[PDB]
Amino acid sequence: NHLFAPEAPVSLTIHGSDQTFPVRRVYCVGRNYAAHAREMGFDPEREPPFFFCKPADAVVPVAAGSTLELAYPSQTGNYHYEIELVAAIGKGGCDIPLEQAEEHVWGYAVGLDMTRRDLQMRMREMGRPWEIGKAFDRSAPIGPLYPASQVGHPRHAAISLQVDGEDRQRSDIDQLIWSVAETVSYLSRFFELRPGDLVFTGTPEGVGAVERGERMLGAIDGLGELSVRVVLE
């Protein structure tokens, strides 16, 4: 008996299906590609990856063959793209063994961890929480969800981001420091994973600023493409 209608849950389109995947929590892995860790001035051999979150309602589903018109955000001069493999949780649990971890992943999609980099870097230098840099409005564009019933659990796949026809990021998901299986196991030590949860597994090297009017195209092998154009605030 709600006082007023809640926000409907953000629901991902599912490739080749009329059914949608309702989003619960949004987990993100930071510094999960050695080359990216190094370009940000960190040592991936002496410090491990780490976890942060975005609200479900920062997730913005983008249909295949469509372009998201994404408003440049408030309170930033330094707005970064980050292409990422997204794993969707179908089966929950705690302290999930590495050997069954990928069995908890219902599907995969192309995602962007859009970032107010100036704000994120200011919070990092002040030892403060990163939410103003990472957990902001429409900060997680994502493509259709591909079921592991279709695409299995890929350990190899090219991951790429182009801006205005220019390659900016090109790596392979097999470069993840914590693989999908490791990230699901380790996340499950700190939180009970549940169906609907998404994991943004981190971004390869080549992250950069994007300005209004510029167009981005991300792709992962087997997972199609993600088209986003940055427009006015």
Binding residues for Mn ion, rule: CB under 5 A, are 82, 113, 203
DSSP summary character for residue 134? H
Containing H/E element for 123?
A: helix 117-126
Min separation Cβ 12 and Mn ion, Å: 18
Query: Shortest Cβ distance from residue 20 to Mn ion (Å)?
Result: 24
Rounded least distance, CB 200 to Mn ion, Å: 6
Instruction: Fill in the amino acid letter for 116.
Output: R
CB of 26 to Mn ion, least distance (A): 11
Report the distance separating Cα 189 and Cα 71, nearest Å: 36
Q: Which of 131, 169, 160, 167 is nearest to 36 (CA)?
A: 169
As a residue count, the chain comes to 233
Taking the least distance from each CB to Mn ion, the nearer of 14 and 210 is 210
The residue with its CB nearest to Mn ion is 113
Sequence-separated (6 or more) residues with CB below 8 Å from residue 166: none
Which is nearer to Mn ion, 49 or 196 (by Cβ)? Answer: 49
Nearer to Mn ion, 111 or 196 (CB): 111
In this complex, which beta carbon is closest to Mn ion, that of residue 171 or of residue 203?
A: 203
Does residue 209 sit in helix, strand or coil? strand
